[PDB]
């Protein structure tokens, strides 16, 4: 609880779309190596032997993402063999868990400088490719009453009273703020364009974005998790636990849910001595982290107790946080989070979110963390809180302070 | 390792051995202790002796034929053994089915063809024996059935049925079509789905056709003779294994779909079958078979299987043997039936009576109404043609026995009357007065009645000896119970004639002594009133309906209350208030009566009047009434779901005990089967009486645990849950 | 700072690969069984205080995919706030989970953490998860991928370990594992696996061959000569180690780690957490460290990792009472013993993976708990646990009995 952990760099690739995406031809190992080489470009005299570990989140560590992709990135990029490399999977919060684990490894005093982030090429390795101890075990699947994240989001909208127009209004809000952030140049220094082995450009923007989105177009979209609940019977299973609810209002579509995209993110985290030894300017400080959870089946109410726990841990309140960043897995989860904690609208996902730019599962946590490092510096604000809902029913939150 | 049930330190012999000059061994199963081959201790030792001999003489054996000398092939097991297996006997249960399957596995990997000569019914272990053979031939004879129905008893096919049907058909088709519901198949449909390979017309052709197939198989396929598909190098499971990408995408939806079908009811057998099926498809055949044994031991030593086995093998069999039928009476064949009333009840009674073979005269006030009553049978037969069950010939003869009329003279020559008009004593008096002299002098005077005592109805006819209550349940074509009510002047011969009529139309009878509400209507009243009480207390209606479905009922209680009509529930409470205040006392009003009157006051008295607890549009149910939550302030009371479930189950169980105390019922067999088939008491309980002796909660098991839980409900919800003295000491 | 203590350290028996007792048991069930044993030992433990469950798993696919740590939390009925994360650092995944749990406790942002690993290699074989290298010839070609087996033979060639030398260590491991079992050393930490009816499935380490003879070990064929020719990995290895003319293939199935199924769990928490829940600490995590060496030999990572964890705790070899290095291959342990001059009677004193097996993701937590027990049995003070890793990595941990 002694060594303060600092963020020195936080970069990410652009997010390529699922259908006819620009990054579909790019191996997820190449997405990480490109970010490693960018860190070298910004700090050429850095002694990489001081880097003691590389922690990458990855929700589907199979195929191109199997065999400890973090260690593969270490060996492929020519980093020292002493730099380790570990893959971890905590569903949607894997990217932020890698950052938090790196920060906690620094706080323990037994690691000095760590790379953290995530990688997910969902166009090459789709969600569910890794099978699953739950889905292959009907005896347990039957008992825990497994219900996909999507039905829980519709259930949250049903319970909280969020209409189809309410969630589509937030989706339009995310598209507008993501376009304003790209036009204003907020992402110019942290989105590292992907290039091939000849230096040719592959992708330099978040191509899932639809900046010309309208209230009228969103209302025409069909609810996307309606045939999932009918053919799978997940509606009836959800209402067996939530027996006071009669019918689930299916409001979520492809336009108000997170996008299926490819991408990676890297964060350099180390102690103050590590920054001074290598001449690195600290950009922010990891104030506190927290892991919690809430009701399963609903699956997505986990970020509420995790935020209160990280605020209680840092001795802060909602009023002390300048920027709130919650992953836009589904619009109703953000609206529930905003309603529970009374988050001011001007502070919540101010540069857009996964509805506009995409949700590359294993990398999203580190992407939205780096987004808040940039926005605190741009606004000259002080504190930001970053959190993500998780599958199974858990949550992860992190507080950072600009330095 | 052994084929035998004992390897230290004496059963009989049930299998005859015969080896022809061609080396084909015919095993003929002929258990001397009964008319049916059964998986008893004698069979296990007999098959073990035969399989040992098959291995010892393998150099002189070219093929095997498994046959039966009974009217059936093989059906069932020794139930007294399974029902007594305690949790501490799980090791012996596990070892027993492992020994059973070790015999079939050796028979299956003998290196030579084995053919099943299925002469009759092959049920449960009987089909499992056949599935261990390499080729199955069935004799398409009437009465023959093939299937694995052990899930209906709370068990699973632990002799290889799960493992082999999954290898044959894949996980999804084997579970849905064969295992989950234990579907029985006629020989023709069994061959269509691949459960059987060939058909023959008569049983005499079976053994010759089997040996002919063995001869051709050895000549045409000598490399793969006696080798099942799953024992070859390139075996590919239909629909794929759980690791295959196509099936791995939908496999997480299988438990949720099962939970949807069961509506959350606590039936562990389908859950165990799905687990054994999927887990078995992940490993080799022998490992899959051992997993199947472990899940089978979980069900046998469990309480639910003991409830279900008690209801079928002991209660239902005692009823079908004549347990409630009086002793001395003989037969009295029935020539012509007279149904009074052409509503959904009378038209349904006319359908099940004509389908069994009887001539039926269907009377109403007008021919227009009686014709629409026969139209109920026409539209049931129109769907039976399109689905292909009945033929075009038999359907026209079925409808031809229904004679719609309005003239009372057409009851000329009727020896069995079934009245089914409005629930009104003075109306029933008149309708029988207009009809008792036109009918035969020996005719049964039956009355379909829900609550009105039969003794009072009989005072409106001359021969009260032949007056009796014959209570049917809507819709009559699908509901299987007939509640026979014995009036005070009803003769023993009238009971036996209606008892035989119930069996003739393919329904199950119970005999009930005359009383208000009888058994079914009185007990189901405590079920609906318990839910209306919860609604008045402030419990959410959606939670009440979920509690009804997750308890295992076929219809949630508010949905059922809209179909029984609240005006009828009102005047039953008014009639019972006269049954006390006329005798000179005070009435104890059920708290549900205040909810019934508030709904009648609001003009929402059920489905008939267009609105009740649910909204109705275009003749179909359209969700709960939105104003229902404001009327009763729903959400103010939030008891746990298990309290709502227990309140409904305990109300009926306690009311069933009262009926046994008062003498309304004369056997617990009638109470269990009557509650299951009559009012839809959940099958997993084994009956509303078995619910007491076989109760299982977090506090304990048995009658003492039922009493303890009933006292928790009484302290928290009212004295109606206090147990009667008959359950105490 | 906040000290991290070990309160419980248990493991399942290790079932063998061919006709193994645990082949019918899902790896999720192996973890849940250990969770249920922790409950039997502390039935009044407030599980809401448990903030995470960190499991190592090298092949997180099929039965082991979908974050098996979270699946164990939900399957066992643990609180939904108890987390659940899977990690993969190849062979040290089990010890990395324990170390990460200790660092989470030292950071002050976690109070009580379950850590360990699970690997059902008979159901999920090694390499089932694909791999970012084998599917990428461009990077496979550049990093010179050579299997850990050939690197072990190469270590024996460079260091001069004969076939008799590695077989002598194999016999030593079988003897000490048999002596530990018969002596009752493993009685309290090995939790027998049972089925849904309570019937016994396995209560001992099946892979052990306690009747092993040095004549029988010499009859075995080198397991990785068929791998070396079919893949050309010998030539790839000698292109980097160009001063070596020929690789002497000394490793067999008798002097290499066993492919087995198993799981392990460790309860780690702060002193205030153990005080608040009535837990008696068994050992303290003194220091952890990670390093590595060449990824073609691959298995020389333990030496710098052990050197680093000793400098970090202010200790040397003579301060350590017991050394526990995973017996992936016999030459790796002999190389380790030679480099740091480890006394013979301090090294893997209760036998190792050659006798009992190497359930990849769980081995680090198994041998960690194996030292927790042997320190209390001998009333010794310090123990150092370390493992070689795929890709050339290494992890080490020093525990102190309390
Ligand atoms: C009549 N019947 N025959 C079989 C046989 F196995 F012979 F094929 C199975 C059933 B059976 O289920 C009916 C089936 O589900 C169709 O509704 C049933 C009723 C009872 C009772 F005791 F509660 F009445 N118990 N069982 C197991
Ligand atoms: B064996 O005699 C048998 C059954 C049991 C158990 F407790 F598990 F029920 N224990 N033993 C020793 C046996 C088998 C059968 C049959 F019905 F054939 F399956 N019946 N018995 C008595
Ligand atoms: C006996 N049964 N089995 C199933 C299945 F296995 F397919 F899921 C469905 C039913 B069933 O009759 O539907 C209502 C239910 O019995 C009430 O709980
Ligand atoms: C005697 N018997 N046993 C079964 C079962 F389910 F166990 F296989 C079915 C019958 B029967 O229909 O008579
Ligand atoms: C009739 N029977 N008894 C058993 C028992 F309990 F002994 F294991 C199993 C069967 B069976 O597979 O039909
Ligand atoms: C009719 N049916 N029964 C099942 C189950 F789960 F009980 F087997 C599944 C379905 B289905 O949706 O086709």
Asked if residue A301 and residue A282 are part of one domain, the reply reads no
Using CA atoms, how far apart are residues C134 and B426, in angstroms rounded to an integer? 90
Q: Which residues pair with A291 in a beta bridge?
A: A396
Asked if residue B560 and residue B513 are part of one domain, the reply reads no
Cα torsion at B166, B172, B177, B181 (round to 10°)? Answer: 90
How far, in Å, are A119, A276, A391, A394, B636 from residue A91 at the CA level? 12, 35, 6, 9, 38
Q: How far is CA A221 from the centre of its chain?
A: 25
Contact C196 B279 (CB under 8 A): no
User: Would you say B552 and B685 are in contact if contact means Cβ atoms under 8 Å apart?
Assistant: yes
**Distance linking the first and last C-alpha atoms of chain A:** 19
Residue B7 bears catalytic tag: no
Q: Which residues pair with A289 in a beta bridge?
A: A398
Place of tokens 């190389």: C335
Asked if residue A360 and residue A334 are part of one domain, the reply reads yes
Using CA atoms, how far apart are residues B59 and A356, in angstroms rounded to an integer? 75
Q: Where among C254, C285, C316 does a domain terminate?
A: C285
Find, among A146, A149, A162, A91, the residue nearest to A395 by Cα.
A91
Asked if residue C169 and residue C107 are part of one domain, the reply reads no
DSSP state letters, C354-383: HHH---HHHHHHHHHHHHHHHHHHHT--EE
Q: Where among C285, C309, C328 does a domain terminate?
A: C285
Asked if residue A218 and residue A106 are part of one domain, the reply reads yes
Asked if residue B722 and residue B694 are part of one domain, the reply reads yes
Using CA atoms, how far apart are residues A97 and A75, in angstroms rounded to an integer? 23
Token pair for B200: 């023959």
Q: Where among B468, B487, B517 does a domain terminate?
A: B517
Asked if residue B342 and residue B226 are part of one domain, the reply reads no
User: Would you say B244 and A124 are in contact if contact means Cβ atoms under 8 Å apart?
Assistant: no
How far, in Å, are B549, C211, C378 from residue C173 at the CA level? 60, 12, 19
User: Would you say C34 and C12 are in contact if contact means Cβ atoms under 8 Å apart?
Assistant: yes
Burial class, B399, CB count within 10 angstroms (exposed 0-12 / middle 13-18 / buried 19+): middle
Place of tokens 């398409």: B140
User: Would you say C309 and C384 are in contact if contact means Cβ atoms under 8 Å apart?
Assistant: yes
Asked if residue C311 and residue C354 are part of one domain, the reply reads yes
Q: Which DSSP symbol is given to C4?
A: P
**Distance linking the first and last C-alpha atoms of chain B:** 50
- Read off φ and ψ for residue C262, nearest 5 degrees: 180, 170
Q: Say how many Å lie between the CA of residue B691 and the centre of ligand 1.
A: 18
Asked if residue B608 and residue B508 are part of one domain, the reply reads no
Using CA atoms, how far apart are residues B146 and B144, in angstroms rounded to an integer? 7
User: Would you say A270 and A114 are in contact if contact means Cβ atoms under 8 Å apart?
Assistant: yes
Q: Whose CA is nearest to atom 15 of ligand 1?
A: B152
Give the best residue of B248, B256, B645 to mutate against chain A (max A CB count within 10 A).
B256
User: Would you say B457 and B340 are in contact if contact means Cβ atoms under 8 Å apart?
Assistant: no
Rg over alpha carbons for chain A, rounded to the nearest Å, is 20
Contact C23 B287 (CB under 8 A): yes
Burial class, A403, CB count within 10 angstroms (exposed 0-12 / middle 13-18 / buried 19+): middle
Structural domain of residue B535, as residue ranges? 518-729
Contact B278 A138 (CB under 8 A): yes
Find, among C20, C23, C121, the residue nearest to C64 by Cα.
C121
User: What H or E segment, with its residue span, contains residue C324?
Assistant: strand C322-325
User: What H or E segment, with its residue span, contains residue B16?
Assistant: strand B15-19
Supply angle C-alpha B304, B306, B312, rounded to 5. 105
Cα torsion at B1, B4, B6, B8 (round to 10°)? Answer: -70
Q: Where among B497, B517, B537 does a domain terminate?
A: B517
Method for this entry: X-ray
- Specify the 3-state DSSP secondary structure of C168: helix
User: Would you say A60 and A125 are in contact if contact means Cβ atoms under 8 Å apart?
Assistant: yes
User: What H or E segment, with its residue span, contains residue B624?
Assistant: strand B620-624
B342 among annotated binding-site residues: yes
Q: HSE (CB half, 13 Å, CA atoms) of B397?
A: 9
How far, in Å, are A212, A320, C178, C303 from residue A176 at the CA level? 8, 26, 69, 55
Close Cβ partners of C120 (under 8 Å, ≥ 6 residues apart) = C22, C25, C26, C27, C30, C63, C64, C261, C359
**Distance linking the first and last C-alpha atoms of chain C:** 17
Close Cβ partners of A103 (under 8 Å, ≥ 6 residues apart) = A5, A269, A286, A289, C107
Chains within contact range of chain C (3+ C-beta pairs < 8 Å): A, B
Q: Which DSSP symbol is given to B724?
A: P
For C:61-80, CB contacts with B below 8 A are 62-63
B339 among annotated binding-site residues: no
The count of structural domains within chain A is 2
Q: Which DSSP symbol is given to B603?
A: T
Asked if residue A388 and residue A292 are part of one domain, the reply reads yes
Best residue among B79, B152, B678 to mutate for probing ligand 1's pocket (most ligand atoms within 8 Å of CB) is B152
B149 lines ligand 4 (CB under 6 A): yes
Asked if residue A312 and residue A175 are part of one domain, the reply reads yes
Asked if residue B189 and residue B338 are part of one domain, the reply reads no
- Specify the 3-state DSSP secondary structure of B294: helix
How far, in Å, are B712, C9, C325, C371 from residue C378 at the CA level? 55, 17, 19, 10
Q: Where among B307, B333, B359 does a domain terminate?
A: B333
CATH number, domain containing residue B123 = 3.90.226.10
Token pair for B437: 């002299």
Using CA atoms, how far apart are residues C178 and C180, in angstroms rounded to an integer? 5
> CB distance from B242 to chain A under 8 Å?
yes
Residue C57 bears catalytic tag: no
Using CA atoms, how far apart are residues B116 and B67, in angstroms rounded to an integer? 6
- Tell me the three-class secondary structure of chain A, residue by residue: CCCCCEEEEEEECCCEECCCCCCCCCCHHHHHHHHHHHHHHHCCCCCHHHEEEEEEECCCCCECCCCCHHHHHHHHCCCCHHHCCEEEEECECHHHHHHHHHHHHHHCCCCCEEEEEEEEECCCCCCCCCECCCCCCHHHHHHHCCCCHHHHHHHHHHHHCCCHHHHHHHHHHHHHHHHHHHHCCCCCCCECCEECCCCCEEECCCCCCCCCCCHHHHHHCCCCCHHHHHHHCHHHHHHHHCCCCCCCCCCCCCCCECCCEEEEEEEEEECHHHHHHHCCCCCEEEEEEEEEECCCCCCCCCHHHHHHHHHHHHCCCHHHCCEEEECCCEHHHHHHHHHHHCCCHHHECCCCCHHHHCCCHHHHHHHHHHHHHHHHHHHCCCEEEEEEECCCCEEEEEEEEEC
Which of C23, C26, C196 is closest, CB to CB, to B298?
C196
Asked if residue C193 and residue C97 are part of one domain, the reply reads yes
Which of B252, B260, B271 is closest, CB to CB, to A139?
B271
Cα torsion at B113, B119, B121, B122 (round to 10°)? Answer: -10
Token pair for A322: 């300048």
Asked if residue C173 and residue C193 are part of one domain, the reply reads no
How far, in Å, are A148, A155, A158, A354, B623 from residue A163 at the CA level? 20, 11, 8, 20, 20
Contacts within 8 Å (CB) and 24+ apart, B9-17: B11/B41, B11/B42, B11/B44, B11/B45, B11/B46, B12/B42, B12/B46, B13/B42, B13/B45, B13/B46, B13/B49, B14/B42, B14/B43, B14/B46, B15/B43, B15/B46, B15/B47, B15/B49, B15/B50, B16/B69, B17/B50, B17/B53
Q: How far is A232 from chain B (nearest CA, A)?
A: 5
Q: Which DSSP symbol is given to C55?
A: E
The count of structural domains within chain B is 3
Close Cβ partners of B208 (under 8 Å, ≥ 6 residues apart) = none
Structural domain of residue A78, as residue ranges? 1-125+186-286
Q: Which DSSP symbol is given to B713?
A: H
- Read off φ and ψ for residue A204, nearest 5 degrees: -125, 5
User: What H or E segment, with its residue span, contains residue B591?
Assistant: none
Burial class, C377, CB count within 10 angstroms (exposed 0-12 / middle 13-18 / buried 19+): middle
Using CA atoms, how far apart are residues B292 and C196, in angstroms rounded to an integer? 12
- Specify the 3-state DSSP secondary structure of C88: strand
Q: How far is C199 from chain B (nearest CA, A)?
A: 7
Asked if residue A252 and residue A150 are part of one domain, the reply reads no
Residue A24 bears catalytic tag: no
* Angle (deg, nearest 10), helices C93-106 and A94-107: 70
Looking at A58, A92, A208, A250, which residue is catalytic? A92
Find, among A155, A206, A222, A201, the residue nearest to A363 by Cα.
A206
Contact C61 A62 (CB under 8 A): yes
Cα torsion at A285, A287, A293, A294 (round to 10°)? Answer: -110
- Read off φ and ψ for residue B537, nearest 5 degrees: -70, -15
Contact C129 A288 (CB under 8 A): no
How far, in Å, are C153, C332, C388 from residue C335 at the CA level? 12, 5, 12
How many CB atoms are located within 10 Å of the residue C9 CB?
25
User: What H or E segment, with its residue span, contains residue B141?
Assistant: none
Q: Where among A256, A286, A316 does a domain terminate?
A: A286
Q: Say how many Å lie between the CA of residue B227 and the centre of ligand 4.
A: 29
- Read off φ and ψ for residue A185, nearest 5 degrees: 75, 20
Close Cβ partners of B578 (under 8 Å, ≥ 6 residues apart) = none
> CB distance from B621 to chain A under 8 Å?
no
Find, among C273, C8, C400, C115, the residue nearest to A101 by Cα.
C115
Find, among A143, A121, A122, the residue nearest to A134 by Cα.
A143
Q: HSE (CB half, 13 Å, CA atoms) of A3?
A: 25
Asked if residue B524 and residue B406 are part of one domain, the reply reads no
* Angle (deg, nearest 10), helices B520-537 and B557-564: 120
Asked if residue B353 and residue B463 are part of one domain, the reply reads yes
Asked if residue C361 and residue C214 are part of one domain, the reply reads no
Using CA atoms, how far apart are residues B336 and B412, in angstroms rounded to an integer? 9
Q: Which residues pair with B509 in a beta bridge?
A: B482
Which of A128, A142, A244 is closest, CB to CB, to B255?
A142
* Angle (deg, nearest 10), helices A331-341 and A164-183: 90
> CB distance from A183 to chain B under 8 Å?
no
How far, in Å, are A287, A378, C329 from residue C171 at the CA level? 53, 66, 13
CATH number, domain containing residue A58 = 3.40.47.10
Token pair for B373: 């009553």
Asked if residue B329 and residue B468 are part of one domain, the reply reads no
Place of tokens 């006292």: B711
- Specify the 3-state DSSP secondary structure of B620: strand
CATH number, domain containing residue B681 = 1.10.1040.50
Give the best residue of A130, A142, A229 to mutate against chain B (max B CB count within 10 A).
A142
Using CA atoms, how far apart are residues B527 and B534, in angstroms rounded to an integer? 11
Closest ligand 6 atom to Cα of B175 = 8
Asked if residue B471 and residue B349 are part of one domain, the reply reads yes
Token pair for C84: 């659940």
Burial A255-282 (b: 16+ CB within 10 A, else e): bbbbbbbbbbbbbbbbbbebbeebebeb
B642 among annotated binding-site residues: yes
Asked if residue B243 and residue B182 are part of one domain, the reply reads yes
Asked if residue A164 and residue A71 are part of one domain, the reply reads no
Q: Say how many Å lie between the CA of residue B514 and the centre of ligand 1.
A: 29
Which of A71, A296, A302 is closest, CB to CB, to C393?
A71
Q: Which DSSP symbol is given to B606?
A: B
User: Would you say C368 and C95 are in contact if contact means Cβ atoms under 8 Å apart?
Assistant: yes
User: Would you say B543 and B566 are in contact if contact means Cβ atoms under 8 Å apart?
Assistant: no
Asked if residue B549 and residue B508 are part of one domain, the reply reads no
Q: HSE (CB half, 13 Å, CA atoms) of B265?
A: 23
User: Would you say C358 and C277 are in contact if contact means Cβ atoms under 8 Å apart?
Assistant: no
Token pair for C374: 């042997």
Q: Which residues pair with C190 in a beta bridge?
A: C11
Using CA atoms, how far apart are residues C99 and B557, in angstroms rounded to an integer? 56
Burial A117-130 (b: 16+ CB within 10 A, else e): bbbbbbbbbeebbb
């Amino acid at each position: 609880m002694s060594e303060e952990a600092f963020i020195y760099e936080a970069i990410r690739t652009p997010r390529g779309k699922q259908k006819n995406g620009s990054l579909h031809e790019v191996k997820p190992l190449s997405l990480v190596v490109g970010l490693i080489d960018e860190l070298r470009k910004r700090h050429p005299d850095l002694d990489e032997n001081l880097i003691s570990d590389v922690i990458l989140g990855c929700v589907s560590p199979v195929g191109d993402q199997g065999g400890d992709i973090a260690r593969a990135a270490v060996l492929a990029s020519g980093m020292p063999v002493t730099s380790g490399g570990v893959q971890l999977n905590r569903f949607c919060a894997s990217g932020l868990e890698a950052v938090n684990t790196a920060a906690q490894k620094v706080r323990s005093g037994w690691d000095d400088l760590v790379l953290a982030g995530g990688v997910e090429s969902m166009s090459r390795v789709p969600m569910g490719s890794d099978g699953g101890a739950m889905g292959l075990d009907p005896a347990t699947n039957y008992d825990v009453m497994f219900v996909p994240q999507s039905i829980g989001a519709d259930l949250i909208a049903t319970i909280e009273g969020f209409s189809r127009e309410d969630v589509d209004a937030y989706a339009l809000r995310s598209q507008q703020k993501a376009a304003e952030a790209w036009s204003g140049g907020y992402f110019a220094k942290s989105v590292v364009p992907v290039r091939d082995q000849n230096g040719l450009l592959i992708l330099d923007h978040d191509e899932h974005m639809r900046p010309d989105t309208t209230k009228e177009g969103l209302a025409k979209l069909k609810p996307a998790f309606e045939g999932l609940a009918a053919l799978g019977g997940f509606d009836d299973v959800a209402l067996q636990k939530y027996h006071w609810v009669e019918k689930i209002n299916h409001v979520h579509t492809g336009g108000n849910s997170s996008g299926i995209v490819d991408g990676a993110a890297l964060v350099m985290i180390g102690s103050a001595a590590a920054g001074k030894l290598q001449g690195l300017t600290p950009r922010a400080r990891i104030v506190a982290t927290a892991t919690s959870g809430a009701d399963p089946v609903i699956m997505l109410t986990g970020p509420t107790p995790a935020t209160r726990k990280v605020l209680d841990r840092a001795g802060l309140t909602v009023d002390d946080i300048d920027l709130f960043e919650l992953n836009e897995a589904f619009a109703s989860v953000v609206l529930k989070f905003q309603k529970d904690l009374n988050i001011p609208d001007e502070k919540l996902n101010v540069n857009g979110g996964a509805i506009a730019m995409g949700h590359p599962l294993g990398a999203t946590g580190a992407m939205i963390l780096g987004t808040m490092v940039d926005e605190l510096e741009r606004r000259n604000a002080r504190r930001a809180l970053i959190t993500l809902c998780i599958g199974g029913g858990m949550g992860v939150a992190t507080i950072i302070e600009r330095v | 390792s052994s084929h035998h049930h004992h390897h230290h330190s004496m059963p009989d012999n049930t299998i005859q051995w015969d080896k022809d000059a061609d080396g084909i061994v015919t095993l003929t199963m002929d258990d001397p202790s009964g008319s049916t081959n059964v998986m008893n201790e004698a069979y296990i030792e007999s098959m073990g002796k035969a399989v040992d001999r098959l291995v010892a003489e393998k150099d002189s054996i070219t093929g095997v034929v498994v046959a039966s000398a009974k009217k059936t092939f093989f059906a069932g097991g020794d139930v007294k053994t399974m029902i007594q297996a305690r949790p501490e006997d799980a090791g012996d249960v596990f070892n027993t089915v492992e020994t059973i399957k070790r015999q079939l596995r050796t028979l299956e990997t003998l290196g030579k063809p084995v053919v099943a000569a299925i002469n009759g019914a092959a049920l449960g272990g009987g089909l499992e024996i056949a599935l261990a053979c390499h080729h199955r031939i069935a004799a398409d004879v009437k009465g023959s059935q093939l299937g694995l129905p052990e899930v209906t008893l709370g068990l699973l096919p632990g002799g290889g049925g799960v493992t082999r049907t999954v290898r044959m058909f894949g996980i999804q088709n084997a579970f849905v079509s064969v295992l989950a519901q234990g579907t029985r198949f006629k020989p023709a449909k069994a061959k269509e789905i691949g459960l059987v390979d060939e058909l023959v017309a008569t049983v005499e052709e079976l053994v010759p056709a089997a040996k002919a197939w063995i001869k051709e198989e050895l000549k045409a396929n000598p490399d793969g003779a006696g080798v099942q598909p799953w024992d070859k190098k390139g075996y590919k499971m239909p629909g794929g294994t759980p690791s295959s990408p196509g099936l791995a995408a939908i496999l997480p939806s299988f438990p949720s779909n099962l939970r949807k079908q069961l509506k959350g009811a606590p039936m562990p057998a389908p859950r165990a079958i799905l687990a054994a099926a999927v887990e078995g498809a992940q490993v080799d055949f022998d490992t899959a078979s051992r997993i199947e044994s472990r899940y089978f031991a979980s069900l046998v030593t469990g309480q639910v299987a003991k409830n279900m086995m008690q209801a079928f093998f002991f209660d239902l069999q005692a009823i079908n043997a004549g347990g409630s039928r009086p002793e001395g009476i003989g037969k009295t064949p029935i020539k012509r039936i007279g149904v009074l009333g052409a509503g959904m009840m009378g038209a349904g009674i006319a359908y099940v009576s004509a389908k069994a073979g009887y001539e039926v005269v269907l009377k109403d006030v007008s021919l227009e109404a009686a014709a629409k009553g026969k139209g109920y049978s026409e539209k049931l037969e129109a769907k039976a043609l399109e689905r292909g069950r009945t033929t075009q010939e038999r359907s026209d003869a079925l409808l031809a026995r229904i004679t719609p009329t309005a003239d009372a003279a057409d009851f000329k020559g009727v020896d069995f009357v079934i009245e089914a008009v409005f629930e009104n004593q003075e109306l029933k008096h008149k309708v029988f007065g207009e009809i008792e002299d036109i009918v035969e002098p020996n005719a049964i005077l039956g009355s379909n009645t829900s609550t009105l005592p039969i003794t009072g109805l009989a005072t409106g006819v001359k021969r009260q000896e032949d007056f009796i209550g014959i209570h049917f349940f809507s819709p009559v074509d699908k509901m299987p119970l007939v509640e026979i009510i014995k009036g005070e002047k009803t003769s023993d011969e009238a009971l036996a004639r209606v008892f035989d009529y119930t069996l003739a139309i393919g329904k199950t009878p119970i005999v009930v002594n005359d009383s208000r509400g009888f058994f079914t209507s009185r007990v189901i009243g405590t079920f609906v009133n318990e839910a209306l009480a919860m609604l008045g207390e402030g419990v959410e209606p959606a939670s009440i309906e979920q509690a009804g479905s997750q308890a295992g009922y076929p219809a949630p209680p508010l949905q059922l209350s809209d179909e029984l009509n609240l005006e009828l529930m009102h005047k039953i409470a008014v009639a019972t208030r006269k049954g006390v205040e006329d005798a000179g006392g005070t009435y104890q009003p059920h708290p549900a009566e205040a909810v019934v009157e508030k709904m009648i006051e609001l003009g929402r008295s059920g489905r008939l009047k267009g609105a009740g607890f649910y909204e109705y549009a275009d003749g179909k149910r359209s969700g709960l009434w939105p104003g229902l939550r404001e009327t009763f302030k729903s959400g103010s009371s939030q008891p746990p779901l298990q309290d709502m479930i227990d309140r409904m189950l305990f109300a009926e169980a306690l009311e069933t005990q009262k009926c046994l105390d008062e003498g309304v019922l004369t056997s617990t067999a009638d109470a269990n089967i009557g509650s299951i088939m009559g009012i839809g008491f959940p099958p997993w309980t084994g009956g509303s009486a078995q619910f007491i002796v076989g109760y299982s909660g977090p506090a304990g098991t048995g009658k003492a645990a039922f009493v303890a839980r009933a006292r928790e409900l009484a302290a928290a919800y009212g004295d109606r849950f206090l147990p009667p003295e008959s359950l105490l000491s």
